[PDB]
Design a protein around this ligand. Structure first.
Ligand SMILES: NC(=O)c1ccc[n+]([C@@H]2O[C@H](COP(=O)([O-])OP(=O)(O)OC[C@H]3O[C@@H](n4cnc5c(N)ncnc54)[C@H](OP(=O)(O)O)[C@@H]3O)[C@@H](O)[C@H]2O)c1
Ligand SMILES: NC(=O)c1ccc[n+]([C@@H]2O[C@H](COP(=O)([O-])OP(=O)(O)OC[C@H]3O[C@@H](n4cnc5c(N)ncnc54)[C@H](OP(=O)(O)O)[C@@H]3O)[C@@H](O)[C@H]2O)c1
Lengths: 287, 287
């Protein structure tokens, strides 16, 4: 379609999403707290609205790409009288319960609301590897599906506005924790004079094979199948201890490896040392 | 090659390494704290030594596959008089400084010592995807290299007996932390009724693309290049906050997400909110 889209928030993601939408033939009206930041997308065909009200009134679809949901309230408060009959799609990080309350806030101002969690960095927006989680009213998703698909293949999760946000937080839980561990291991090796340039390829090389190493688990966790034939919590917990020890001696952050160590210690304390590592999920669920 | 090899410790890794060595034509003499556990490898051609001394005396190469280095002292103490002239290869998890002291202990008993860290699970032992870090005397590595290659491609790191162990701990830092985060995210989604069988493929699907998403870092960390064009610590820190918040509300472990949150808080506190996420390594290095 060539339906008009409004996009508020021109960080790298809003800029990429704007460009994707322009390339696909949508007129895009933008607004940004910092108008100078819109110069690039305006040169590429975006229209810079002078005020939030003007931006909101430009289209029946308002996409938000902001750091958090407080930013949505900040920018849309002067425009709440212009929301009726439009769909707000918030593509921003926050808690699921912030998101759920925001959806009701939209309804109160006469708008529909969809939650989106964009699952790739800005350069990958609008490519074949892009995808976005969505949740909220099915009818509102279907209405805008074809426009939204320009950004990334949609994965609709259902009616709960919180759910796409929960999926995003869970995905970023894995992503951010993995990244922190890469920096932690890089730091640890750096302590014996190993370059990050030497370290990081070794660590990434291993990380690339992790899905495979795991398959050499979801249903098993659901089925309580935690058998320790090829790797026990005892043995992995010992390695967790060795990492804490090495970290202590290296003088680097202890909080991250200690959180991991605790997952194993809890499982052993509860009498499941002989089980597979998936067993640590029980202590995680019940601190 | 057909050099005789002794392997002590018949967990899944010792069993796999024994079988790989037998398949490649090496006579393998085994000993285990629990002799019944050797029935399988003996059926496949291994010789079960009655005592640790007998096992050590069977060959010039003694491989240890035990949960930690204390286990090495436990099993080899009765046999310290039979170590002279032989090479101990310890393929067990422990701290780098435990490893370094153990190497000197071997030297005092007239043996040579090599550190190894086996980087794949037991089913992948002896396959084209297997690899093992080694460190210790170059001459001792060269002497046994062709036997050791049966287990996996060697990656020799140099003379410091601690270094292959530090590499192993840094690798398992990433691997265990990644796994903990998978279980953490699985738990978080399970809190809204999402199955692990539904959750885990979504999480793995994302994890598979992490090397790619990163390239869409080592030399930059070495060069202090931490520019926040496409993703800032401010923005990623906010998501870390949202994960903590979602975790609080879900009633799951807070220690793991809080350790990640702290990486970001520290960087912002030190005035680097505008930087790329790699900047968290500075606070990690200086707790
Ligand atoms: N970058 C990524 O790779 C990536 C990937 C997927 C998801 N995300 C998510 O996408 C969203 C946008 O991220 P991003 O990296 O593009 O950018 P960002 O650094 O979060 O900035 C996005 C926009 O937020 C605006 N903003 C922040 N606080 C505001 C406030 N209180 N009032 C008004 N405007 C406010 C900024 O305004 P100014 O321009 O005036 O500073 C900017 O336009 C975030 O929720 C993030 O978690 C990011
Ligand atoms: N499993 C993997 O996927 C994997 C991958 C790479 C590296 N590793 C490392 O490889 C090593 C072996 O791990 P694994 O999973 O094969 O097995 P494991 O569960 O660590 O057990 C290995 C052996 O240790 C013995 N043992 C432990 N404590 C002992 C003690 N105090 N005295 C004597 N024997 C003792 C056990 O004796 P019993 O048989 O009598 O119980 C068993 O034979 C570990 O250091 C682990 O970190 C494991």
């Amino acid at each position: 379609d060539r339906t008009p889209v409004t996009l508020i928030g021109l960080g790298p993601m809003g800029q990429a999403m704007t460009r994707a939408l322009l390339a696909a033939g949508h007129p895009v009206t933008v607004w940004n707290r910092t108008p100078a930041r819109a110069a690039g997308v305006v040169a590429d065909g975006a229209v810079l609205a002078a005020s939030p009200v003007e931006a909101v009134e430009a289209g029946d679809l308002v996409i938000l790409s902001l750091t958090d949901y407080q930013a949505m309230y900040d920018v849309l408060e002067p425009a709440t009288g212009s929301l009726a009959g439009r769909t707000v799609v918030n593509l921003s990080s926050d808690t699921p319960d912030r998101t759920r309350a925001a959806a009701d806030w939209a309804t109160e101002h006469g708008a529909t609301f969809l939650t989106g969690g964009v699952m790739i960095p800005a350069p990958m927006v609008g490519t074949e590897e892009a995808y976005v989680y969505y949740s909220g009213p099915a009818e509102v998703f279907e209405k805008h599906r074809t426009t939204l698909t320009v950004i990334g293949a949609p994965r609709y999760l259902g009616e709960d506005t919180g759910l796409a946000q929960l999926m995003y937080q869970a995905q970023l839980d894995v992503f951010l924790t993995t990244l922190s561990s890469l920096m932690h291991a890089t730091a640890l090796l750096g302590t014996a004079g190993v370059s990050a340039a030497e370290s990081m390829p070794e660590l990434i090389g291993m990380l690339r094979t992790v899905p495979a190493m795991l398959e050499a688990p979801g249903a098993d966790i659901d089925a309580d199948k935690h058998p320790g034939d090829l790797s026990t919590i005892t043995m992995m917990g010992a390695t967790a201890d060795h990492i804490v020890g090495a970290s202590e001696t290296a003088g680097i952050d202890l909080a991250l490896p200690r959180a991991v160590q605790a997952h194993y210690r809890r499982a052993i304390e509860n009498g499941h040392g002989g089980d597979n590592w998936t067993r640590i999920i029980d202590g995680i669920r019940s601190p």
